[PDB]
Design an enzyme around this catalytic site. Structure first.
Site, mmCIF file in Angstrom:
data_model
loop_
_atom_site.group_PDB
_atom_site.id
_atom_site.type_symbol
_atom_site.label_atom_id
_atom_site.label_comp_id
_atom_site.label_asym_id
_atom_site.label_seq_id
_atom_site.Cartn_x
_atom_site.Cartn_y
_atom_site.Cartn_z
ATOM 1 N N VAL A 13 0.843 -1.188 0.017
ATOM 2 C CA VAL A 13 -0.057 0.024 0.065
ATOM 3 C C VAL A 13 0.964 1.114 0.078
ATOM 4 O O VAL A 13 0.364 2.619 -0.115
ATOM 5 C CB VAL A 13 -1.074 -0.057 1.304
ATOM 6 N N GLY A 14 2.260 1.197 -0.001
ATOM 7 C CA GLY A 14 3.028 2.095 -0.007
ATOM 8 C C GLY A 14 4.359 2.097 -0.231
ATOM 9 O O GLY A 14 4.950 1.004 0.122
ATOM 10 N N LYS A 15 5.143 2.945 -0.951
ATOM 11 C CA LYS A 15 6.480 2.720 -1.493
ATOM 12 C C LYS A 15 7.174 4.235 -1.303
ATOM 13 O O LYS A 15 6.517 5.194 -1.638
ATOM 14 C CB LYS A 15 6.908 2.111 -2.781
ATOM 15 N N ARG A 17 11.249 6.441 -0.222
ATOM 16 C CA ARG A 17 12.694 6.157 0.114
ATOM 17 C C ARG A 17 12.812 5.893 1.534
ATOM 18 O O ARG A 17 13.868 5.473 2.134
ATOM 19 C CB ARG A 17 13.316 7.774 -0.019
ATOM 20 N N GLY A 19 11.242 2.749 2.441
ATOM 21 C CA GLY A 19 10.982 1.573 2.349
ATOM 22 C C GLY A 19 9.757 1.164 1.708
ATOM 23 O O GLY A 19 9.155 2.032 0.754
ATOM 24 N N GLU A 20 8.758 0.441 2.314
ATOM 25 C CA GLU A 20 7.550 0.015 2.051
ATOM 26 C C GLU A 20 6.687 0.017 2.922
ATOM 27 O O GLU A 20 6.903 -0.374 4.125
ATOM 28 C CB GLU A 20 7.454 -1.417 1.146
ATOM 29 N N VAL A 21 5.221 -0.090 2.856
ATOM 30 C CA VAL A 21 4.285 -0.259 3.826
ATOM 31 C C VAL A 21 3.450 -1.286 3.045
ATOM 32 O O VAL A 21 3.065 -1.259 1.886
ATOM 33 C CB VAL A 21 3.273 0.971 3.960
ATOM 34 N N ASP A 135 8.020 15.580 11.415
ATOM 35 C CA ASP A 135 7.737 15.134 9.934
ATOM 36 C C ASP A 135 6.199 15.082 9.811
ATOM 37 O O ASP A 135 5.589 14.179 9.010
ATOM 38 C CB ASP A 135 8.249 13.930 9.379
HETATM 39 C C1 LIG Z 1 -0.733 2.796 8.983
HETATM 40 C C2 LIG Z 1 -0.633 2.903 7.344
HETATM 41 C C3 LIG Z 1 0.441 3.452 6.865
HETATM 42 C C4 LIG Z 1 1.525 4.103 7.741
HETATM 43 C C5 LIG Z 1 1.769 5.357 7.422
HETATM 44 C C6 LIG Z 1 2.772 6.215 8.356
HETATM 45 C C7 LIG Z 1 3.750 5.246 9.228
HETATM 46 C C8 LIG Z 1 3.485 3.970 9.331
HETATM 47 N N1 LIG Z 1 4.274 3.284 10.137
HETATM 48 C C9 LIG Z 1 4.146 1.854 10.436
HETATM 49 C C10 LIG Z 1 3.229 1.350 9.632
HETATM 50 C C11 LIG Z 1 2.309 1.817 8.835
HETATM 51 C C12 LIG Z 1 2.390 3.201 8.493
HETATM 52 C C13 LIG Z 1 0.769 3.772 5.653
HETATM 53 C C14 LIG Z 1 -0.412 3.441 4.601
HETATM 54 C C15 LIG Z 1 -1.741 2.689 5.358
HETATM 55 N N2 LIG Z 1 -2.404 2.295 4.445
HETATM 56 C C16 LIG Z 1 -3.670 1.661 4.861
HETATM 57 N N3 LIG Z 1 -3.787 1.212 6.110
HETATM 58 C C17 LIG Z 1 -2.848 1.828 6.996
HETATM 59 O O1 LIG Z 1 -2.999 1.687 8.436
HETATM 60 C C18 LIG Z 1 -1.634 2.470 6.605
#
Ligand SMILES: Cc1c(-c2cccc3ncccc23)ccc2nc[nH]c(=O)c12
Length: 298
Positions: A13-15, A17, A19-21, A135
């Site tokens: 769900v995320g990429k 600098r 890393g990745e989520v 941030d």
């Molecule tokens: C919690 C989360 C993050 C997230 C953002 C910022 C810092 C984070 N740090 C650790 C884990 C996730 C993080 C990013 C995308 C997401 N998309 C759907 N649902 C979610 O909960 C979610």
């Protein structure tokens, strides 16, 4: 009990600098997993310290589950496992819906309440220190099912204790998001050995998030498209020099749409906004003051 070995990575769900989520499955339930890039390993250490040693926990702060390390592909990954919010980041959320007055205020107040929790020390045995985020941005905010938000990403946190007057800035080569950088940062006048300096940087960034949210509140059948701060004077991935020209040299600030002056809520939010944006960092409102004001606006 919750360890990386037992989480199934389902969807990215995320990429960035950082890393990745990932969205992960742990015993059926969805969890959020941030897998840190090699270049961001210091942010993992800092977040692991805040969540494990300081035991940070608040309904408007992203819910921590566990820190872990997993060896995979002949490398060692640093994981941060948190609650998963179906609604996603405030950044993506604002682009998919507009807000009424109640939902707009519930969002910004919840963020204020999250930021006040960080900034305010709790004294006594095992007390929590004052914490500055450094941030804050819409991508570092998530939307919960009850319409409130929570603040995430403590990789740059700075801590302070009134008693010992100890300032802990950590050791992280990471620099905050340039688009949200306060003027005293862009022109390097910020007082780095004064804790109040980092709180005031949070307030500047908060002001910008409040601008991002208010634009999406409908009034009299009108609403602005989602836009990030300074969308009209800087390119994507703006450079340091780009931001200083806009924020410092030209003393520019996010524009207030004239239609806001036809709505009492947006007019008060416009005033609140601007009182976060003073070039003079010490003139900005405090997080507690913002929270108080937002509690009274309706
Ligand atoms: C919690 C989360 C993050 C997230 C953002 C910022 C810092 C984070 N740090 C650790 C884990 C996730 C993080 C990013 C995308 C997401 N998309 C759907 N649902 C979610 O909960 C979610």
């Amino acid at each position: 009990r919750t360890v990386a070995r037992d989480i199934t990575l389902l969807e990215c769900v995320g990429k960035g600098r950082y890393g990745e989520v990932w969205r992960g499955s742990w015993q059926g339930e969805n969890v959020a997993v941030k897998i840190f890039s090699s270049r961001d390993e210091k942010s993992w250490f800092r977040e692991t310290e805040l969540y494990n040693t300081v035991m940070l926990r608040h309904e408007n702060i992203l819910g921590f589950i566990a820190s872990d390390m997993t060896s995979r592909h002949s490398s060692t990954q640093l994981w941060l496992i948190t609650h998963y919010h179906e609604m996603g980041s405030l950044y993506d959320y604002l682009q998919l819906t507009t807000l009424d007055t109640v939902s707009c205020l519930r969002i910004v107040l919840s963020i204020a309440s999250g930021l006040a929790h960080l900034h305010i020390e709790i004294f006594g045995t095992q007390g929590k220190p004052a914490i500055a985020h450094r941030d804050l941005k819409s991508k570092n905010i998530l939307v919960k099912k009850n319409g409130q938000c929570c603040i995430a990403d403590l990789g740059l946190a700075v801590m302070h204790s009134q008693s010992t007057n100890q300032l802990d800035v950590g050791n992280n080569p990471r620099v905050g998001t340039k688009r949200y950088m306060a003027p005293e940062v862009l022109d390097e006048t910020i007082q780095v050995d004064c804790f109040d300096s980092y709180k005031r940087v949070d307030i500047w960034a908060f002001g910008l998030v409040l601008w991002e949210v208010a634009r999406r509140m409908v009034s009299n059948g009108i609403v602005e498209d989602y836009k990030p701060p300074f969308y009209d004077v800087v390119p994507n991935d703006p450079s340091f020099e780009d931001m200083r020209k806009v924020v410092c040299v030209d003393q520019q600030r996010p524009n207030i749409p004239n239609r806001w002056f036809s709505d009492p809520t947006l007019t008060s939010l416009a005033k609140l906004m601007k009182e976060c944006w003073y070039q003079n960092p010490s003139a900005r409102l405090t997080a507690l003051r913002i929270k108080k004001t937002l509690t009274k606006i309706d």
